[PDB]
Design a protein around this ligand. Structure first.
Ligand SMILES: C[C@@H]1O[C@@H](O[C@H]2[C@H](OS(=O)(=O)O)[C@H](O[C@@H]3[C@H](O)[C@H](C)O[C@@H](O)[C@H]3OS(=O)(=O)O)O[C@@H](C)[C@H]2OS(=O)(=O)O)[C@@H](O)[C@H](O)[C@@H]1O
Ligand SMILES: C[C@@H]1O[C@@H](O[C@H]2[C@H](OS(=O)(=O)O)[C@H](O[C@@H]3[C@H](O)[C@H](C)O[C@@H](O)[C@H]3OS(=O)(=O)O)O[C@@H](C)[C@H]2OS(=O)(=O)O)[C@@H](O)[C@H](O)[C@@H]1O
Lengths: 370, 366
């Protein structure tokens, strides 16, 4: 049920160099230097727990951060994170809503609250009309402010994979949650039609016939995580083949893609728990081979409005790549000269200033910059 | 050695340790389970969403455990430097005394990797006294037998705090830490003090034994998690040697070992978490291996916990007894013998075989 494509409210995009995405939180205000860094990205999602130890709440920390970004670069697009079912902390208005309205939280068929794996974070019962209205208004009100361009909707997949809630609250309640989810996304599709809606939705799933593409009709694009984390008995290569296919199709349909890929395992060095975390050599040859590989996966998929983030977590103060620009982000890229060519697990693609070769079996790639 | 305050111990079957938290009160069944262990540490965030605070949730839990088995020994967790949440008395103390928290030279708070949990500045006398009294007051209550002191190694590895507040402030933190542990050694001399202290470290020529004189025993973690460029096998060799020496000297050992991959199945994030078959052949091989490491080290007052995290409601082994915990074990008939990376040890009802290099063990039960 995709809408006719209208790019009026889309972020800036250029093929000149790597198109980059930022997805970030910090417990206190960003420094001036950090704001300048954020404002250099074309598309930024502000996560939950947004500077709440400076501004008292995520709502106020989001407003302050977005204002500061826009004053440095008013062309940067800023999205507000919102989880559609998990009642995470540090939203002052959510705390008040739940305090005053305990019936807003999700219960199992034995009338017990159900929780995330930490045993303490509960869920919104979005089947209840007043919860739907509270949640929708909270998103619409924040997006209507001058420095927020849209919203990042999270936990779509927890709604849509039936076992996630059916194992907690039963089969019928899962279907009711899903029905209400669709109602709520229909509401946002209309109310935010002059804004951006990005969702955490494309994902290799045995339950999804089209690996999330069938759910993109509500959204201007998808964020990607778990993209190289195989499951379901599939090999790493098999799993990436399906994710690449889905991402290519979505990107070629004009949807925004924000592909996140973790470097945490390539940076970890067995330090930082009971000793100082050893400074990572960001020029390390092996680390840069990993950057090449992950960027090759992205470039095999990318179209206009595709953006990449190679991250060490979304908390700014605990990320080894915070404030850093890899050399691969500065080199001339240029527009594609064709689609990727797939031969088994080997992919190639040509850009005006770059040739990409990717082997998913060996988890190696070459970026030959021209 | 004064054993008068030590826990019960028997070689009849595997000697077990429990180390646990839950956000709400334990059920009756869960209290009975806890009371079946000879030694239990109640972690931070102890039933605080039922009792309002870890302090009162600890008191309620300990009272219930002791009513079911008054011989069970119950320890109160206390972190010597990290200001973790859900202690109502700490929240009051820190709100009234913001200067109690550790700051750098710019008077900025420094934090754990989460960027939000700060540290006690134990270089300040009033912080030392608040902390010591908080431990002594809780241990003095009738259903608590002692304390589990955590984060010793964050004080004693100089880079942990020097990288945050400088080498000289770290040296002062260390000096104050030793003063505090000398104080506790005396005030808790009729109680138990267990510390997270034995650990393979390049900074520790004796891998933590040089600090064990303050305490009745050591808890072990990170025991099979190599670092510093060391092989897994040689890292375990050094930990085994430290643990053997401590146990043979009469110190309590509580060895925790994470079940690890064997109990992880790549589900539960966006889908239902699938049952891991607790009678699986491969899991049972991992249990055999981890218990073999323990048994190569164990002496009287050594206890083991093979875990899937310390949060009861998120652990696949909560309330579970592996078959290896029920079989007759019996007293050791000699110390372990080390031949390369292969260790053997005989007990009255068990022969242990262990190969660190392949991470394999054979338990031959009689
Ligand atoms: C602010 C922190 O929130 C919880 O941690 C989350 C974690 O959030 S973080 O901002 O990435 O650190 C992250 O949340 C996911 C993230 O939002 C991406 C974009 O989409 C989903 O994967 C999010 O997960 S979920 O909302 O569907 O669950 O990952 C979660 C699993 C949490 O991480 S966890 O490892 O801590 O469980 C808190 O748990 C943190 O303590 C912190 O408050
Ligand atoms: C209650 C939780 O506290 C923090 O989580 C800790 C975690 O605590 S837990 O009770 O095991 O879940 C654990 O703490 C360690 C544990 O106490 C052992 C016995 O000794 C040290 O290793 C403790 O760590 S530390 O105090 O020296 O840091 O491990 C920590 C690293 C934390 O786990 S973490 O992965 O979440 O960082 C909170 O972070 C939890 O959210 C929760 O509030």
């Amino acid at each position: 049920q995709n809408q006719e494509i209208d790019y009026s409210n889309y972020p800036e995009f250029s093929w000149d160099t790597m198109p980059l995405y930022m997805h970030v939180r910090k417990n206190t205000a960003y420094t001036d230097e950090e704001i300048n860094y954020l404002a250099s990205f074309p598309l930024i999602t502000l996560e939950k727990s947004q500077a709440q130890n400076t501004y008292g709440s995520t709502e106020e920390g989001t407003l302050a951060t977005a204002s500061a970004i826009k004053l440095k670069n008013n062309k940067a697009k800023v999205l507000y994170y919102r989880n559609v079912v998990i009642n995470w902390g540090n939203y002052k208005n959510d705390d008040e809503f739940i305090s005053k309205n305990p019936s807003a939280l999700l219960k199992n068929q034995n009338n017990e609250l159900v929780y995330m794996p930490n045993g303490s974070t509960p869920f919104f019962d979005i089947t209840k009309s007043f919860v739907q209205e509270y949640w929708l208004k909270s998103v619409e009100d924040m997006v209507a402010t001058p420095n927020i361009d849209g919203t990042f909707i999270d936990a779509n997949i927890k709604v849509l994979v039936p076992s996630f809630f059916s194992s907690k609250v039963g089969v019928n309640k899962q279907a009711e949650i899903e029905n209400s989810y669709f109602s709520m996304m229909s509401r946002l599709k209309e109310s935010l039609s002059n804004n951006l809606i990005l969702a955490n939705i494309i994902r290799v799933r045995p339950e999804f016939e089209e690996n999330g593409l069938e759910y993109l009709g509500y959204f201007n694009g998808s964020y990607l995580e778990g993209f190289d984390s195989e499951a379901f008995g599939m090999s790493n290569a098999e799993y990436l083949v399906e994710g690449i296919e889905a991402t290519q199709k979505a990107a070629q349909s004009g949807k925004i893609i924000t592909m996140t890929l973790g470097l945490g395992e390539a940076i970890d060095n067995n330090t930082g728990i009971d000793d100082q975390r050893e400074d990572v050599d960001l020029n390390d040859e092996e680390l840069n081979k990993r950057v090449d590989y992950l960027l090759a996966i992205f470039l095999i998929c990318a179209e206009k409005y595709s953006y990449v983030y190679l991250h060490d977590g979304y908390l700014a103060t605990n990320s080894a790549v915070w404030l850093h620009q890899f050399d691969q982000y500065k080199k001339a890229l240029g527009a594609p000269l064709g689609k990727a060519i797939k031969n088994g697990y080997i992919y190639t693609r040509k850009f005006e200033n770059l040739d990409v070769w990717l082997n998913l079996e060996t988890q190696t790639a070459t970026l030959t910059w021209k």
